[PDB]
Every structure is written in C-alpha cells, then in structure tokens.
Amino acid sequence: PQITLWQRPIVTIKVGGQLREALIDTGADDTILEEINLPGRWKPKLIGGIGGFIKVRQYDQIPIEICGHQAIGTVLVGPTPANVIGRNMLTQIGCTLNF
Amino acid sequence: PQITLWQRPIVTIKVGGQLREALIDTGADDTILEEINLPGRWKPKLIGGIGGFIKVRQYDQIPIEICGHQAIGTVLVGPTPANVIGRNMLTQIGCTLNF
Numbered sequence A, B: 001p002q003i004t005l006w007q008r009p010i011v012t013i014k015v016g017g018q019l020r021e022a023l024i025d026t027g028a029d030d031t032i033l034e035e036i037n038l039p040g041r042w043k044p045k046l047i048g049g050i051g052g053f054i055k056v057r058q059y060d061q062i063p064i065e066i067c068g069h070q071a072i073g074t075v076l077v078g079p080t081p082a083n084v085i086g087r088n089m090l091t092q093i094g095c096t097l098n099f
C-alpha cells in the first residue's frame, strides 16, 4: 500500500504465531515489540531512545509478516511503549518515503 | 525525493534561521529538536518515548524548511538524542510511505 501520515501508520503483523499491530517507524533502526512470547535463544541488550534506555531480549532470524509481506530478521522484545517496525525489516518489504 | 531506508532517512532543515540535520520519523507524532535557540513564548511539556520521558519547550507556529519544502507548526525543543521530523510536519510536505 501507500500510507499517508495523517494518522499513525499502524499495520497488522504476524510474528511468533501471534497477531499484533505495529507502527511503521522510519526513525527506528531496529524492530522492537512489547512483551511477546518468542521461541528459542536470545541475548540481553540495552537500547536508547527518547527518555533513556531499556533492557530488551534480542532474537535473531525471526520471521514476520508485515501487512502481508514476508521478512526475517532481528526482533527486540522489551518494555517499549509501542510496537515498532524498524528499517531492518522495512528495507526487506521495499518500504520507501516519498514527497 | 524518494528516500529508501537502507540508511537513516536524514535530511537538511532550516529552522529559527539555523541549519540542522534531522530524521524523517514516521513513528514520531511531533517534531523534536535538540537544544536550539528559537524566538518567543514557549510552554514546558513532558513527552514520552522508549526509555521514559523528557521535559521539552513547546514552540507553536514555527516555520521550517524540510529538504526544500516549507511547513509551519509546533516544534518541541529538549534533550532528544536525535532531531526528528514528526507527522505534524511530514503531512504538510506530502510525505507518504510506500511498499
């Protein structure tokens, strides 16, 4: 699709067998999801944003469906106030900015 | 322009008579700039992101040039780790997401 920005650009994703809504976030380098049960090994990571840093679980090579497009990559799980799809996934689905 | 997301989508802005670089940030509702000297009245605001909240100065009806496009709107100034152009400005320059 084309998505305008009059509202938050929220899409449906499937990840870990579960359905969620997430923001298409061009200001996010990585993909960060609120607490969600994902399978397998992970590494603890501290990440920074507006207001300080959070501890996340890093999961690699996680398949995700983003508004009906398939991607695979790193997903960080932790106490984010919003589920965000970052550039690591957006590049795989061919997402661009236009003006 | 069209901007792909293999790198951070950084553009040149002019605001308050000053030149800066800023991220085109579809996950930002508002426009937030690092400490920068802007003229006139402001209101203190607390805003939230990944890792907690910051105190910002809110300035209204601020003209900004964003990669050669003119907009006017609210700019929040405070201790953001990155200058971000949010949807309040992106909608005015006709910025869309496409995949």
Ligand SMILES: CC(C)CN(C[C@@H](O)[C@H](Cc1cc(F)cc(F)c1)NC(=O)O[C@H]1[C@H]2CO[C@H]3OC[C@@H]1[C@H]3C2)S(=O)(=O)c1ccc2nc(NC3CC3)sc2c1
Residues within 6 Å of the ligand: A023, A025, A026, A027, A028, A029, A030, A031, A032, A047, A048, A049, A050, A051, A082, A084, A086, B025, B026, B027, B028, B029, B030, B031, B032, B047, B048, B049, B050, B080, B081, B082, B084, B086
């Ligand atoms: C949903 C939030 C996460 C929104 N945010 C925008 C994201 O795009 C930020 C931008 C950013 C980029 C940076 F480089 C550094 C930063 F500090 C911030 N990015 C980020 O979280 O990225 C993180 C993580 C992603 O992976 C890596 O990439 C960079 C790092 C790193 C770890 S915001 O800044 O909190 C925000 C902006 C405006 C705004 N307006 C509001 N208005 C009121 C509600 C009406 S609320 C509000 C909130």
